[PDB]
Amino acid sequence: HMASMKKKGSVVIVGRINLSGDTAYAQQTRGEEGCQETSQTGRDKNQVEGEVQIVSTATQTFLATSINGVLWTVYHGAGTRTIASPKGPVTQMYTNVDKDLVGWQAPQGSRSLTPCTCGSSDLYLVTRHADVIPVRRRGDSRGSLLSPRPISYLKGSSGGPLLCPAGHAVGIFRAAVSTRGVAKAVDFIPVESLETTM
Ligand SMILES: COc1ccc2nc(C)c(O[C@@H]3C[C@H]4C(=O)N[C@]5(C(=O)NS(=O)(=O)C6(C)CC6)C[C@H]5/C=C\CCCCC[C@H](NC(=O)[C@@H](NC(C)=O)C(C)(C)C)C(=O)N4C3)nc2c1
Ligand SMILES: [Zn+2]
């Protein structure tokens, strides 16, 4: 009945992939209990840093990547959810189910990647475990792993970046292409689609 209808919680930043130095590594900034509470209130006063965030809802965890002042992620992770922020929940400024893409204004303190203009096909995928995986671009939205891995290795990394050798953003990781459970290729949202969506 109408009186009892519930509200879905916000997406919550729970950590980041640290790429600032010589070694990439995941950092957690909020535990599961505090995540649950923050999703309900939508109020997150934690300091945000970096380009690649680890994000969670009550039921899923994945990544989000700042490019040109927008924190981007996948619709299959975030749906239409707000993101928690210091002043309460923030509505998406981009939503495109056809591209599996959503975006919010980038949090204060985040740093943004620059869209790639290199035209290079030697890419790097950053996972939620801070693995930096070489990927050869094979089309507008496809790349092959130089070393295939079980899909388990990639699960939870949608919303993460594919980068060029210079560290520019080339795309947002969307889906794995698997045969017999092995990811030989990845599907990604090209940065040009983001730049157009914008
Ligand atoms: C609800 O509205 C929408 C709108 C658009 C949309 N567009 C889509 C393309 C879409 O894809 C679905 C989600 C996406 C996915 O799991 N992504 C992540 C990830 O990590 N997620 S996650 O864990 O962070 C999560 C779950 C918390 C968020 C990167 C992969 C990591 C590991 C792979 C695990 C096995 C799944 C293999 C799927 N791959 C295939 O189905 C391909 N087929 C074969 C045979 O290979 C292809 C892609 C069909 C060729 C696949 O990757 N999937 C299915 N869903 C949607 C929904
Ligand atoms: Zn580049």
- Could you state, in order of their start, the residue ranges of all structural domains in the chain? 1-113, 114-198
Radius of gyration of the chain (CA): 16
Residues in the chain: 198
- The tokens describing 179, both together, are 């045969």
Binding positions for Zn(2+): 116, 118, 164, 168
124: CA distance to ligand 2 center in Å? 11
Compute the distance between CA of residue 145 and CA of residue 27 in angstroms, rounded to an integer. Answer: 25
Asked if the domains 1-113 and 114-198 are classified in one and the same CATH topology, the answer is yes
Cα three-residue angle 133-83-49, rounded to 5 degrees = 55
Helix residue ranges, H only, 4-81: 32-41, 75-78
For residue 100, the ligand closest to its alpha carbon is 1
- The tokens describing 42, both together, are 């939508």
| CATH topology classification for 1-113 | Thrombin, subunit H (2.40.10)
For residue 116, the ligand closest to its alpha carbon is 2
CATH 2.40.10.10 for domain 114-198, yes or no, is yes
Helix residue ranges, H only, the chain: 32-41, 75-78, 191-197
